[PDB]
Amino acid sequence: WVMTCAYAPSGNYVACGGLDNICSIYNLKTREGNVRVSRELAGHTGYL
Amino acid sequence: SELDQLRQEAEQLKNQIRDARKACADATLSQITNNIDPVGRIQMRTRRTLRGHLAKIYAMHWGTDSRLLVSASQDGKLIIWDSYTTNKVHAIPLRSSWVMTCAYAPSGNYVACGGLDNICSIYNLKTREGNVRVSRELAGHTGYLSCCRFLDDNQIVTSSGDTTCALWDIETGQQTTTFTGHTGDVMSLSLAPDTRLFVSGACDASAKLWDVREGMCRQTFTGHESDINAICFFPNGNAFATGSDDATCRLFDLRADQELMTYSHDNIICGITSVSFSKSGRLLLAGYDDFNCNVWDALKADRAGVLAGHDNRVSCLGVTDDGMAVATGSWDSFLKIWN
Amino acid sequence: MASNNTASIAQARKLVEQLKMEANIDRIKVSKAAADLMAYCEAHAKEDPLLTPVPASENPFRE
Amino acid sequence: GSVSKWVRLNVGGTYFLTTRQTLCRDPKSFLYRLCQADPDLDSDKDETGAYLIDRDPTYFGPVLNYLRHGKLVINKDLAEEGVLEEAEFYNITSLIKLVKDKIRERDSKTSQVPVKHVYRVLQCQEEELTQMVSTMSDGWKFEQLVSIGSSYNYGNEDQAEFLCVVSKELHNTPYGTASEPSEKAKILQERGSR
Amino acid sequence: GSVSKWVRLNVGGTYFLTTRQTLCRDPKSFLYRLCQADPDLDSDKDETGAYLIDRDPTYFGPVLNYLRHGKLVINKDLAEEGVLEEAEFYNITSLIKLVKDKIRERDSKTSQVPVKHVYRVLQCQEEELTQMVSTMSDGWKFEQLVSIGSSYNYGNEDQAEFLCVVSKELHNTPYGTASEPSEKAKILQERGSR
Amino acid sequence: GSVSKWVRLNVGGTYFLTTRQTLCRDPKSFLYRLCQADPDLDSDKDETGAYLIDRDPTYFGPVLNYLRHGKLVINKDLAEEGVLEEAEFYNITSLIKLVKDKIRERDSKTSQVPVKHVYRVLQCQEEELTQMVSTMSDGWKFEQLVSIGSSYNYGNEDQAEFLCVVSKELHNTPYGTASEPSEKAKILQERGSR
């Protein structure tokens, strides 16, 4: 149940939010070779 | 400090170096001559469509037998094709995607791979079982690998980022002969047939030719203003083509120490991405970021033809070691064997 | 290091050297090397099937 | 030395009986200094005599095995870290190298809590399928075969007949991160994006 | 007894021979008091002076390991919990902190009782298939790929032709059974259901 | 050795009181010579009248067990490698060979931990299928079955209708090898590649 799709103002990161109440920040571009989650943001008892 | 005399001492030397080339400069008899035999139109068909990739091929490189070519995908797989029977001799998946070097050893017994992993993998094709087993994973490259080439099957020169193209003894995993002096990261690694000197392009548009075991910059040619993509030596090893992100290629000579003659047209605006010399060296075959590759009469500077048919850029080009067939590392996931 | 701004004297030394041994190597005139290339290419133009097509079963690349 | 060829040393209260040549094999060690007399050693037992050394007999086993027979043995209960620290105590550089190499191997294989698992999709046809599955690159695992119909001539007789999805466990990047990408690398990533 | 530099320490019937200064490594261990000379120590071995400390010899091992050189190693056949409790008895706070950290890290790396997974369907086709398979998110595991049974666009190179699936473990921190609902969130759940 | 049939040894400081007969089981044994008098042997301890064998008793146990009762069982915490290395010092060939087999059996079972799996592809028509599925070689595993449509003997009942992948784990049970320098093998490998 995610409703938010946040695109970085550079296109190098992505973000999303849902009823989980935790925001997902994904480091898109990395020479690891694949997308890896950069950060998760909790601190709300309500949905983003 | 001492830089005052250093910055001076370079200048004059650079000055005289330019003057030396201007002293060496003559009218280019090749382009002056039109009585040399024409090569005619070459709209040759492709005979093999080695489909079987699911990602854009970055680099393809022929083997010494002119039957097995290693093709590296963008996703991280090495397909050791069989150009005759379109059969995959081996598929080597890698630990890391974005591989752009496919170093076929001059034996058909080892293959070297590398990319943004910053680690040069060395795979022994022959093993006790008969299947692929990684021989080594040469670490010690700070930057990304750009191109790798075997001298021995235990010695390999590995052009990389971080302004280095140092040479590795495979068994010890140690850089043996380090090369420094580039300001831009190294991209090209072209080996002369003599295998005692290698010229490397970079992002500083300066093709630096190094003596392999000495670690010394034998020459530093410059005719470009943009990053050099690929360099292919003459089968003589006396002169090499040089392509960059521009609308022209160049031919640099070691003996003259200056550009012999350039390969330019306003007919195309896209960058050079690969260069190749045939058996004779008469044909300069250049891959292009335009969705087809071109073939120029290297001794007449006019486009002998264009190998039309691709719809995605020819990301790499490689001519057979017999110098009579050429393969495209196109981005359409297909390698087309032009003959 | 503040007297040589992170030891930029090594790169100047190497630049001076490589210029010196670029001056050391002989200058071979452009037309000489050009004619050498014409001679080599036109010598090996009877053995490059790209310039001279070969029958379909007389080469392994129309196989 | 200061005594007959054989010696006894009281490692943690455990008397080990051995010849000095097993100890004098590497001249750089605590044990080597123990063998020869000097005004810095008064150590002996008051019961039947033994040079006093308050170290761990449990982690002295593989250490003394590295000297008696020039190679170490790793028990299934004595941790590699203990033999590592004990070897560092007696300054045996090569033994430390071997132990730390084994520790690195084990940790790199098993510290992969996520295991990462990198996945690859080989495209093969029925004929080469048996070859490349049998001649599979050691260090990977086959985990899926998906038959695809043939884009030409029914569902077979084409190079596009099977997708072999393989995978292998790993530690993604020694860095676990980008680790200073150059401009050219990012440009190539943008290019290869589409 | 306290004869010479060493001391006999009868931990659980085992007579450690340990350095007085290793005991004096910190006052946190009460052994320091035993090392010093001041009235106490009634119960002792009345033939040498070996103090009878009735504690586990095995779990005193790593404690003395830490106490002798300031580095902790724990045996691979002895539970971290026994070392923890022995640390509590011998009262070395830093050792307690380190063992608690080790236990917590070990249990969190393997924090999964019924093993929960979250599964995601990735609609794609053959072309970009390897792209998402390689760029598959780190931590997830590919589990199964199917081809859509479809008659449009020949069923080959059809844009909708494949349904990858991927799973990522949970019950390490579950979200389905950890519920803090919002009234508008439930309104939107109902809206999405209908 | 001409007195005290229950001859007492001091192996690693441990008094092993063992009969002459057991040691004389295999005269190829260093100790068999100690069962008899010989003039070069001048290795002795004059504190217990027992001769010296400056090798550890921790691995002498299983060796003496095998030599006494023609068979050994190593503990599940004691290194097979240590028993082996103690074994050649007394030069019992059969024991060393058997321990080599045991060691390689164990290492084959731990080469499983590295990602090393041997894969094979079999072909089957529908009738015979379960027969190999049931009576398949013990110690392998079923991994995948794919039905590939056929026009030669259309669809079902064609031999090439079903492809069954199987696999086991890579092993080095009798031994493992990385290369065979014999040329003709390399010639045949090159021939059979294409």
UniProtKB/Swiss-Prot annotation, chain A:
Which branch of life, at top level? Eukaryota
The record's WD repeats, renumbered to this chain, cover 1-42
According to the record, mutating residue 8 to T results in: In MRD42; decreases receptor-driven G protein activation; decreases complex formation with gamma subunit; decreases trimer formation with alpha and gamma subunit; no effect on protein abundance
Its assembly, as annotated, is: G proteins are composed of 3 units, alpha, beta and gamma. The heterodimer formed by GNB1 and GNG2 interacts with ARHGEF5. The heterodimer formed by GNB1 and GNG2 interacts with GRK2. Forms a complex with GNAO1 and GNG3. Interacts with ARHGEF18 and RASD2. Forms complexes with TAS2R14 and G-proteins; these complexes play a role in the perception of bitterness. Component of the TAS2R14-GNAI1 complex, consisting of TAS2R14, GNAI1, GNB1 and GNG2. Component of the TAS2R14-GNAT3 complex, consisting of TAS2R14, GNAT3, GNB1 and GNG2.
Query: What disease is this protein tied to?
Result: Intellectual developmental disorder, autosomal dominant 42: A disorder characterized by significantly below average general intellectual functioning associated with impairments in adaptive behavior and manifested during the developmental period. MRD42 patients manifest global developmental delay commonly accompanied by hypotonia, seizures of various types, ophthalmological manifestations, and poor growth.
> What does it do?
Guanine nucleotide-binding proteins (G proteins) are involved as a modulator or transducer in various transmembrane signaling systems. The beta and gamma chains are required for the GTPase activity, for replacement of GDP by GTP, and for G protein-effector interaction.
UniProt similarity note:
Belongs to the WD repeat G protein beta family.
Instruction: List the protein's name.
Output: Guanine nucleotide-binding protein G(I)/G(S)/G(T) subunit beta-1
Q: Which gene encodes it?
A: GNB1
Full-protein residues shown here are 99 to 146 of 340
UniProtKB/Swiss-Prot annotation, chain C:
In the record, N-acetylalanine modifications are located at: 2
Q: Which GO terms describe its cellular component?
A: extracellular exosome; heterotrimeric G-protein complex; membrane; plasma membrane; synapse
Per the record's keyword annotation, is Cell membrane included, yes or no? Answer: yes
Give the main location. Answer: membrane
Q: Which InterPro entries match?
A: G-protein_gamma-like_dom, GGL_sf, Gprotein-gamma
According to its UniProt entry, the protein's GO biological process terms are: adenylate cyclase-activating dopamine receptor signaling pathway; cellular response to catecholamine stimulus; cellular response to prostaglandin E stimulus; fibroblast proliferation; G protein-coupled receptor signaling pathway
Example of a GO MF term = G-protein beta-subunit binding
Task performed by this protein: Guanine nucleotide-binding proteins (G proteins) are involved as a modulator or transducer in various transmembrane signaling systems. The beta and gamma chains are required for the GTPase activity, for replacement of GDP by GTP, and for G protein-effector interaction.
What is its quaternary makeup?
G proteins are composed of 3 units, alpha, beta and gamma. In this context, interacts with GNB2. The heterodimer formed by GNB1 and GNG2 interacts with ARHGEF5. The heterodimer formed by GNB1 and GNG2 interacts with GRK2. Forms complexes with TAS2R14 and G-proteins; these complexes play a role in the perception of bitterness. Component of the TAS2R14-GNAI1 complex, consisting of TAS2R14, GNAI1, GNB1 and GNG2. Component of the TAS2R14-GNAT3 complex, consisting of TAS2R14, GNAT3, GNB1 and GNG2. Component of the TAS2R14-GNAS2 complex, consisting of TAS2R14, GNAS2, GNB1 and GNG2.
Indicate what this protein is called per its UniProt record.
Answer: Guanine nucleotide-binding protein G(I)/G(S)/G(O) subunit gamma-2
Question: Could you tell me the gene encoding this protein?
Answer: GNG2
Swiss-Prot record, chains D, E, F:
The segments labelled Disordered in the record are 174-194
Alphabetical UniProt keywords: Acetylation, Cytoplasm, Host-virus interaction, Nucleus, Phosphoprotein
Residue ranges annotated as compositionally biased, kind Basic and acidic residues, are 181-194
Signal peptide residues on this chain, from the entry's feature table: none
Question: Could you tell me which residue ranges the BTB domain spans?
Answer: 5-107
Induction line: Up-regulated in peripheral blood lymphocytes stimulated through the T-cell receptor.
Q: Name one GO molecular function term.
A: identical protein binding
Highest taxon of the source? Eukaryota
Q: Does the keyword Cell membrane apply?
A: no
Q: What processes in GO biological process is this protein linked to?
A: proteasome-mediated ubiquitin-dependent protein catabolic process; protein homooligomerization
Q: Which GO terms describe its cellular component?
A: Cul3-RING ubiquitin ligase complex; cytoplasm; cytosol; nucleus
Localization (cell) = Cytoplasm, Cytosol; Cytoplasm; Nucleus
Listed under subunit, the entry gives:
Homopentamer. Interacts (via C-terminus) with GRASP55/GORASP2. Interacts with CUL3 and with ubiquitinated proteins. Interacts with CRY1.
Known role: Its interaction with CUL3 suggests that it may act as a substrate adapter in some E3 ligase complex. Does not affect the function of Kv channel Kv2.1/KCNB1, Kv1.2/KCNA2, Kv4.2/KCND2 and Kv3.4/KCNC4.
Q: What's the domain remark here?
A: The BTB (POZ) domain is atypical and mediates the formation of a homopentamer instead of a homotetramer. Homopentamerization is due to the presence of 4 residues in the BTB (POZ) domain: Leu-17, Gly-61, Val-73 and Ala-79.
Q: What is this protein called?
A: BTB/POZ domain-containing protein KCTD5
Q: Which organism is it from?
A: Homo sapiens
User: Which gene is transcribed and translated to give this protein?
Assistant: KCTD5
